[PDB]
């Protein structure tokens, strides 16, 4: 399948070169997979989600996304126009308040929630979790992410936006999950992207158009935007049967575009997520 005039990041993940604008992908499109977006919520009523999104858990007075961040990330995973995996099922877990903030204890509870809640959902092709959040190093936060991964969920986490080594941030620094840095449309490391040996992969993160609250759209930047590209890619590849939740991060690294990014610090992987789709 071909989506013309796609957001640059979608085009990038199906291309061996920057500078194109059509997204190519197998029409299975992540059908039969599920992606949890652990964030500020999801505006599931947005036309872009087509009834495939739903809130399953909140730790606050509403499950509604009063911020936009979670809706934007969910859109990059799986919206019809802005999403990588256009037929996946999206499940929202609201661990962040409408200012985008959340306590680590709540975030940990949300991760353990997903590890159990997947047993209440129909995801025959597999389960992914997208975590566009983080703070300073916490062994307890890292352990929660490790448990979620161990339970059979492909965990993708943002590297962080400090232009610093991600070893000092959580859950970015957990070795067993997939830690995602950000790139721009010219294949440069995004100016704010964290780096370091703990990164597994880069995805598009600068000037990413996606869904927003109020049935709208906007373009914003962050490792929060790169992470759902990778989460959606994992769901798409799992639906194709090419990989599993336990092996998807390694598979994405195996099949990535290699050596094409600029300003990658010595010792950080130079790997850009790529779907390897041959139309």
Curated annotation (Swiss-Prot):
Q: List, for all copies, the residue spans of the domain called Peptidase S8.
A: 7-279
Residues reported to bind Ca(2+) 2: 16, 260
> Is Secreted among this UniProt entry's keywords?
no
Kindly state which reaction or reactions the protein catalyses.
Answer: Hydrolysis of keratin, and of other proteins with subtilisin-like specificity. Hydrolyzes peptide amides
Query: What UniProt keywords are attached to this protein's entry?
Result: Calcium, Disulfide bond, Hydrolase, Metal-binding, Protease, Serine protease, Signal, Zymogen
Q: What are the GO MF terms of this UniProt record?
A: metal ion binding; serine-type endopeptidase activity
Between which residues do disulfide bridges form?
34-123, 178-249
What residues does Ca(2+) 1 bind to? 175, 177, 200
GO CC terms, sorted: extracellular region
Active site residues according to the UniProt entry: 39 (charge relay system), 69 (charge relay system), 224 (charge relay system)
Single Gene Ontology BP annotation: proteolysis
- The EC number(s) attached to this protein equal 3.4.21.64
Report the superkingdom from the record: Eukaryota
Q: How is the cofactor bound?
A: Binds 2 calcium ions per subunit.
> What cofactor requirement does the entry state?
Ca(2+)
**Job of this protein:** Hydrolyzes keratin at aromatic and hydrophobic residues.
Family assignment? Belongs to the peptidase S8 family.
Q: What is this protein called?
A: Proteinase K
Species, as recorded: Parengyodontium album (Tritirachium album)
């Amino acid at each position: 399948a071909a989506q013309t005039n796609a957001p640059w990041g979608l085009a990038r993940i199906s291309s061996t070169s920057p500078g194109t604008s059509t997204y190519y992908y197998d029409e299975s499109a992540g059908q039969g997979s599920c992606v949890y977006v652990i964030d500020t919520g999801i505006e599931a009523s947005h036309p872009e989600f087509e009834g495939r999104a739903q809130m399953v858990k909140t730790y606050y007075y509403s499950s509604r996304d009063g911020n936009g961040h979670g809706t934007h990330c969910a859109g990059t995973v799986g919206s019809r126009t802005y999403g990588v995996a256009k037929k996946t099922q999206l499940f929202g877990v609201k661990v962040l308040d409408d200012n985008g903030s959340g306590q680590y204890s709540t975030i940990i509870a949300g991760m353990d929630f997903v590890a159990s809640d997947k047993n209440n959902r129909n995801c025959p092709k597999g389960v992914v979790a997208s975590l566009s959040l983080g703070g300073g190093y916490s062994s307890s936060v890292n352990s929660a992410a490790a448990r979620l991964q161990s339970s059979g969920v492909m965990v993708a986490v943002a590297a962080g936006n400090n232009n610093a080594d991600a070893r000092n941030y959580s859950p970015a620094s957990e070795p067993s999950v997939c830690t995602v840095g950000a790139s721009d449309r010219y294949d440069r490391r995004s100016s704010f992207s964290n780096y370091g040996s703990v990164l597994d992969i880069f995805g598009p993160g600068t000037d990413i158009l996606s869904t927003w609250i109020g049935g709208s759209t906007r373009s914003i930047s962050g490792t929060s935007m790169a992470t759902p590209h990778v989460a959606g890619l994992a769901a798409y590849l799992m639906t194709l049967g090419k990989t599993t939740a336990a092996s998807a991060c390694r598979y994405i690294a195996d099949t990535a575009n290699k050596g094409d990014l600029s300003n990658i610090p010595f010792g950080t992987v130079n790997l850009l997520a790529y779907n390897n789709y041959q139309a």
